[PDB]
Amino acid sequence: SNNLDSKVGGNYNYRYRLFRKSNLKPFERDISTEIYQAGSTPCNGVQGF
């Protein structure tokens, strides 16, 4: 789809889930965008260490 959608300064419309708690089952879908906790802390608000 380069010839339909490649932008010169990158087509930053599109998005994917980079990290999730575990595997998703076949034909499931998860839209929930909440913060991942790589540090063991009960992380809350928009960011953290």
Partner 1 sequence: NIDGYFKIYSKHTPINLVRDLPHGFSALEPLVDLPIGINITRFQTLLA
Partner 2 sequence: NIIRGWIFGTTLDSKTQSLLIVNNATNVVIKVCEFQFCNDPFLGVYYH
Ligand X SMILES: *[C@@H]1O[C@H](CO)[C@@H](O[C@@H]2O[C@H](CO)[C@@H](O)[C@H](O)[C@H]2NC(C)=O)[C@H](O)[C@H]1NC(C)=O
User: What is residue 14's three-state secondary structure?
Assistant: coil
Give, as one character, the DSSP assignment of residue 37.
-
Q: Map the footprint of ligand X across residues 1-20, applying CB under 6 A.
A: none
Closest CA to 49 of 38, 17, 15: 38
Q: Map the footprint of partner 2 across residues 3-42, applying CB under 8 A.
A: 29-32, 34
Q: Taking CB under 6 A as the rule, does residue 34 contact ligand X?
A: no
Q: Map the footprint of partner 1 across residues 10-49, applying CB under 8 A.
A: 25-30
Q: Return the CA Rg of the chain.
A: 16
Binding site for ligand X (CB under 6 A): 21-22, 24-25, 28
